[PDB]
């Protein structure tokens, strides 16, 4: 019930247009928590079961052994919406605190945060 | 035609369920400019035509006399998503050096990326 | 179709040079991305070098700048690297691969990301 940062959830993604976006399917929670507890929405980073290596810097690899996804992914960072918490179906688990740096870092990359 | 950060657009956020996002209506470019080249996708933040004045410190206020937008409103740093560039119909301006680093600081809030 | 052979591989003395050949088939060199990757035995795959899809961003491995050089000619869609004052800690198998990815070698990194279509081996010795 308590939506954190970092938690791996399974949401429905869908309907989004055009490609890329599908239905239901993984994500990861950016929303910092104190907007976690208190806003309507949550900020996601997309999961995708795809070609799943990291292509670019705002890529950050997870694999299924120690996360309930399918098959090894990637966080995509430069794939990102805000949803409705109604719209999170069930959880899977939680970053580790030195995966959730990985993705810190690439997130600030995505979005010119630095220099 | 090149998308730059801070730019302000007006693409068409419709069909996105449930409430608060709807049609064309104007947003800001927050993806960093390498990714704004070339990926397919863009990373927006919402500008509200609604109750408008910063209400949280992921809030920015922009106003309708340095900015082509209707009514004086704010930038939704909590409300984001991605866009293929196809979305984004016309530009009308880009934001100034003091109030995209307002940007920059009110989305490292939003995101957690700061401590 | 088919895809990428590389060219230009020998035995070099310490501090000598060499320039390695990279044919493209089965696709336009201007959609993707092109990097070098040596393997030498006992040791896990080092990126060496990329090329963008589009050829304006270049990176390159901390143990490689200033040495090598990552070229293209898109009009032969072939893709050339440099190697210059090469030690005998850089002999390997390279190979050139192909990423159809957007955006990839975009970045100023210092580490170039493993591709998704490679092709056949190539021997780099360096040794008196």
């Known amino acids: 019930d308590p939506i954190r940062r970092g938690d791996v959830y399974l949401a429905d993604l869908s309907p989004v247009q055009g490609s890329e976006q599908g239905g239901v399917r993984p994500v990861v929670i950016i929303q910092n928590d104190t907007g976690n507890k208190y806003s309507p929405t949550v900020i996601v980073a997309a999961i995708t079961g795809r070609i799943n290596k990291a292509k670019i810097p705002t890529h950050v690899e997870i694999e299924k052994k120690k996360y309930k996804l399918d098959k090894d992914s990637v966080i995509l960072l430069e794939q990102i919406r805000t949803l409705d918490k109604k719209r999170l179906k069930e959880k899977l688990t939680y970053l580790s605190d030195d995966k959730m740096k990985e993705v810190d870092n690439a997130l600030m990359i995505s979005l010119g945060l630095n220099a | 035609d090149p998308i730059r950060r801070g730019d302000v657009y007006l693409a068409d956020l419709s069909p996105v369920q449930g409430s608060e996002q709807g049609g064309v209506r104007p947003v800001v470019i927050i993806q960093n400019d390498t990714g704004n080249k070339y990926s397919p996708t863009v990373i927006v933040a919402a500008i509200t035509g609604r109750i408008n004045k910063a209400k949280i410190p992921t809030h920015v206020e922009i106003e309708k006399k340095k900015y082509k937008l209707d009514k004086d409103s704010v930038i939704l740093l909590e409300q984001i998503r991605t866009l293929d560039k196809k979305r984004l119909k016309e530009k009308l301006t880009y934001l100034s050096d003091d109030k995209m680093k307002e940007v920059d600081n009110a989305l490292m809030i939003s995101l957690g990326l700061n401590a | 179709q088919v895809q990428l052979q590389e060219s230009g591989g020998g035995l070099v003395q310490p501090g000598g040079s060499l320039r390695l050949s990279c044919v493209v088939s089965?696709?336009?060199?201007?959609?993707?991305?092109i990097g070098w990757f040596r393997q030498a035995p006992g040791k896990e795959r080092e990126g060496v070098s990329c090329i963008s899809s589009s050829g304006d961003s270049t990176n390159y491995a901390d143990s490689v700048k200033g040495r090598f050089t990552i070229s293209r000619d898109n009009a032969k869609n072939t893709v050339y690297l440099q190697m210059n004052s090469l030690k005998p800690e850089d002999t390997a198998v390279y190979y050139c691969?192909?990423?159809?990815?957007?955006?990839?070698?975009?970045?100023?990194?210092?580490?170039?990301?493993?591709?998704?279509?490679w092709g056949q081996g190539t021997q780099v010795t360096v040794s008196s």
């Open positions: 089965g696709f336009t060199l201007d959609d993707y991305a």
């Open positions: 691969a192909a990423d159809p990815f957007p955006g990839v070698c975009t970045y100023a990194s210092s580490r170039i990301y493993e591709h998704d279509y």
